[model samples]
Target: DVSFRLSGADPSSYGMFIKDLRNALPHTEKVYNIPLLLPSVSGAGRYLLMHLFNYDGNTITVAVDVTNVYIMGYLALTTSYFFNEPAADLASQYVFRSARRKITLPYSGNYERLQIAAGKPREKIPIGLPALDTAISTLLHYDSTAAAGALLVLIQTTAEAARFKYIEQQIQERAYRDEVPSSATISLENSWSGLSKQIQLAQGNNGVFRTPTVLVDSKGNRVQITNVTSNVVTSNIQLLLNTKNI
Candidate 1:
């Protein structure tokens, strides 16, 4: 029941780090949708619907609006199992460039005229069940405090500390890793202590909803994201839940 914005440019590269953040969540869930906002150096940009899903227990309704961005020369990839169905083939698919804000999601032909554009470097790929399962695990396990803490850490500490394995693990697994220029990012603009204090203040028995926190003591801080290397440019992770008990 907590909603907030995580905003900032990739502090190190100035690219959108949300792409990696997307990989940190469970790929399959009862409720999940990814709407990506593309930025332009022009007057304005568009928020393309990148991924969509409607969950009913074990049944999931999923669709990705990849054509919307591909037509614009933007590349995108979904780790969701939505593509496993026959209907998904009826829709256009492409490889999204996992880079800066302006990175082009490529296509060999015009998406609008697919009849003439269909015969390109066509590749049929299958959905990854592991990513779906991992995404679900993250969604089910992430606590509200952890969500807020991870987001705040990015704003306060070093940029990479804000991302990577810290609070974003699930979505990053299937994220498109590419080498491109960094672009501006949107992330929570806050500090670590401020966030931790907030967590301490909020009162709730949402056990599974515990905050993604880094244990710190007098000697020093022990962390993990520092253990890996990633040039994750664009990333984002959003969660939705059924409020039966929430």
Candidate 2:
């Protein structure tokens, strides 16, 4: 099958992905060019561009950071928003703040009933699936279903901001056997990432983000940037799936 790939994460890193992909997929025809198109939506568009993953694909599309990172902080990492917009701009743009769960993954029913098993579960019955990849692979085994021939995986990794403040509060409120390092404090800082800088650049036009991402499809269909957060990305993705020809 013919394929097109686009990557944006510093020049060196993207180059490496290209080199690796070329080596791995020898049968594929490949042509690559530099400079990912920066987004051009404003205000709320800025925040939407932050977690914006690919839009409009028949297969795998739209992988947004739902947790482990702050949306605003991710954008702020690459862009300077201090003079350009306020944190409120995030709300204005429709970037929704992620709700934090005490645990990263949901506890399975079997795992949750540990107390009933001999008054204690097998100390570690090995919780949840290993990872999303594993989950998809397991599903791939069951070809009896309609989705047997269709499989897509979208990955969403969080920037550091999501749990930064709450984690810090835990450090202050409770004492740990080990002392926290000054440098470790910086680990929670989200302002240093490249996402924010891109947000600032996108702010020049009506407060929408201009780079890092835009509401476009893999086939180059464009949509009016609206509701940077909430269900906007998911909704746009649906639109893309409907438009692209199979």
Candidate 3:
């Protein structure tokens, strides 16, 4: 059992601990119940439980704390399906962002291709609904306002990426048409127009998008909340999860 004391006070350094830990450890069948002492900005300390399962010779890390688990799980799932360099880098990006780090993962090269694919589905909504929904669902259960806001920002960021991709595709098509003979060029004007509409629909006015919210409480009753900003819903849901008066 390997144990260490880590300072979580500097949120930017949050991902550094796990990155260094995994690098130093090298090979382990699994890391079980590793205790993490996390410090808040207020100088208070809290204990968070973490476990790692090896998948494809890589560490599949999880934190028992409310926010990290969801972020970790999404990374794991994305890696499992895509299993590429971008997929792997995205895992690290999530860790850094979860800790309120200033680092932003810029989509480029093969990673740009992967992000475009994830965001721009052939026929459905441009956003990755499953991934976004899962993140929102898990985050709302946490009692932290900061966590909720972080999740909201993530949604907006992803929406903008989707919109950018649609525009990029349009530019590429225009460039191709400029060079190709009219007889050989395929005019996809209608298709491109439809994509523009979809972009607007997926990314709402001013970067705020709407998604259905459904929460099932401990009592096995289906709960529904509507017509609220993403941040407000998350705060309210966090209260519900904690059984606090809202």
Which of the numbered candidates is closest to the native, going by highest TM-score?
3
Question: How much does candidate 2 score in TM-score?
Answer: 0.18
Per-residue lDDT of model 2, residues 188-231, tens digit only:
23222332333334334544445434333224464343322412
Per-candidate TM equals 0.18, 0.18, 0.19
Q: Say which prediction, candidate 1 or candidate 3, comes out ahead on TM-score.
A: 3
Best-matching candidate per lDDT? 3
CA lDDT, candidate 1, residue 124: 20
In candidate 3, which residue ranges exceed 4 Å CA deviation?
A: 1-49, 60-117, 120-246
**lDDT (Cα, tens digit) per residue for candidate 1, span 101-220:** 322112222212221222321112111222232222332333333222221222212122223233233223223331111111112211223222223223243222134433332234
| Model 3 C-alpha lDDT per residue in residues 1-246, reported as the tens digit of each score | 112222121222323333333333222121111211111212101112232222122222232222111122222322221123443344443342344322222222232242353453222222222222333344333323323332332322231222223322322333212221121011221122232232233334443324333444334465443333432232211101111111
Candidate 3 local lDDT, residue 167: 23
Q: Candidate 1: lDDT of 237?
A: 20
Ranking by TM-score: 3, 1, 2
Q: Which stretches of candidate 1 lie over 4 Å from their true place?
A: 1-82, 86-246
